[PDB]
Symmetry: C5
Subunit: 159 residues, 5 copies
Amino acid sequence: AKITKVQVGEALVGDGNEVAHIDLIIGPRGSPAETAFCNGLVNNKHGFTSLLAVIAPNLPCKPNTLMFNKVTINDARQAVQMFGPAQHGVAMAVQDAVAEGIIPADEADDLYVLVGVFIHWEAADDAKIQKYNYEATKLSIQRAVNGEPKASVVTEQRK
Amino acid sequence: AKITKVQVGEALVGDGNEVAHIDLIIGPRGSPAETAFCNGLVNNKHGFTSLLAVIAPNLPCKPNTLMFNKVTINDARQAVQMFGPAQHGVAMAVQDAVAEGIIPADEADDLYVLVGVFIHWEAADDAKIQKYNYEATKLSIQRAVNGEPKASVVTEQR
Amino acid sequence: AKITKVQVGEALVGDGNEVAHIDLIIGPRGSPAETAFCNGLVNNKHGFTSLLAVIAPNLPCKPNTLMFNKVTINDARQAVQMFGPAQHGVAMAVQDAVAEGIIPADEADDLYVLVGVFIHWEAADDAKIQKYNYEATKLSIQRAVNGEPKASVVTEQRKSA
Amino acid sequence: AKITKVQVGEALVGDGNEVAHIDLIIGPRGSPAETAFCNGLVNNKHGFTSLLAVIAPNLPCKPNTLMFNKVTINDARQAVQMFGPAQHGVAMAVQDAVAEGIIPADEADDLYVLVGVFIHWEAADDAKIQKYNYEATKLSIQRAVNGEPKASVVTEQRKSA
Amino acid sequence: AKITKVQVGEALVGDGNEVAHIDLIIGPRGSPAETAFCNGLVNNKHGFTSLLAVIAPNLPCKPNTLMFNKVTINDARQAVQMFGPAQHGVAMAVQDAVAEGIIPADEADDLYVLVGVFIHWEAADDAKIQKYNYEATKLSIQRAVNGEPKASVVTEQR
Ligand SMILES: [Ca+2]
Ligand code: NA
Ligand code: NA
């Protein structure tokens, strides 16, 4: 609950070739999350795309979510995994976070989410790609919104 | 004014290989839509271009519109589609949105529209490319200007 | 006219293979025109360059002008067309716009001009490349500073006057 | 706070093919380090990646750190090097700087670190790769935070090699 | 202070294959020079690098300087010219500008310099690469810091 500035979250969930790694940023209007969202939607290159995540055709998740790949997409199969299972899991995770109140419903129309997904070339099981990305995204959102892991917590784990 | 902050719209219209998916951003002077517009016109890479959309030679649509592709343009054919039917449909959608009261005419000279078009490699029918991008762009503008869909609506419909 | 905010202009001028299409943005210090100018000079890639336009060696045009290609530069022939005739045409147009008062002389040191140049692979006549890019840039500057075409005008002619 | 503006640090540490060269920027929320962090995480290309540095799985270092390679990653081994020892050395350095108070712990949740890593393709000793990046990062962080070297100091030494 | 806003400089110095062309931006904290410096350090790609210029190992010139290439670096020989003689010339130019009073010593820790270099791949004499880049860089800093050429001056020479 309550997001008044940029927050970063990250998670690794799953196993095998479909394991899902997610880097995430969320922030309000007027912040760098908003400018990076706009620039990120406009700037694409060979192998590296970005899209406005939707949970169903003509139904984008809210808050506005820009999803982009961190592992290069070199053929139709990798693209399909990105736009099908992975997009669906990320989008569902964002909307469920609003449904559950992790992202407050009254801020949801004024926030931006940036989601970097890592889908291995070896991934093949769509049901797992979808599920693991859904879980890694939901986890990254809760960690980002609650500011975790806290500095001191991580500090006292290196010494 | 009606459009006082950055808004994002999206739509998927059509069928077959010419189906049009549009990602759209609209915003006023002083907003990130303006900065994204300037950076986007300046930064291009092989296969990924951007241009100031026009209705006809020497007749840009207003509000100022930056159209850019989201599917790599690998050959001349795709490029002719981008610059021909797709650009015409996008530009017509923007001007028609002003005409239909979707974008207030008194704000037109002070807004920026960013339109990401997705033209499949298999797309081949020019008339459909134009028509569907026109329809998906206009619907994306309509939605963005009104903040649609609202989070509660998506949450509910989820 | 006086330039206190970001203005956008464009023009298509000429015929044959050397036809020039210019997309242009002009703006003051503190505006996104300035930030895109700085990032644009810094960020280059294979086949896509940007340069600080000059009218002569060691003599850039003012206001500061960042020119960048829209068509991939695949060989020396195209790099020379970009750096030779197109650059000279663009730079001359900016400077002439200042000499003519279109860009006021008392603002020229505080503006930034971003110019996207589209040179078709078929272009071959250098005098025409230079001429048409000079004209299209001059025309784009005039349209940008005067805010032309006004939305009301384009709306009335969207179907054609 | 102690780190109230953007600071830049750099360091070259180690020997051999594992020698580590680190370019580093650190700064608070609202500064260009935050904007460059968000953009840098979002914008990747063939051979040039960026990642949120972690000391362990599901355990990112704090302050938030964006690590990116300066040498094109063309094969799988360069990637393992980048993601394995390099990342680990960098991430440890950042946490240790917080532990030692170089980066105050009461602001570690409000700063961003940008770390550019250079790894020659001839590097092979994961053990060195990791220690040199750890040391180069740690040095780069204290140099940035303390504003070293001062301009006056560099000016004095600009001639004596 | 003397450098209180973003300034742009350029110069062409030398002859043969080692001729040096420099495009340059300099500016204070809080200016777009600072933001372009940070973005430019982060964003690199195949053939196009950026680095924090140093006079010697562990000795960066000050003001903080981001040097980047404008000509594609395709092989190890071009990379060595970039990181070796060109970098040394650029870094010495920045430090000498401070020593010669071109950049105020008391502003040196608060400025950012962005230097774009154009090394022809045919360039072969390292001493000339270093000398011409040093000369073009110092001249570009001198021009930028003083706003030269002034528009009236270029207009008169045109
Ligand atoms: Ca880029
Ligand atoms: Na409407
Ligand atoms: Na001087």
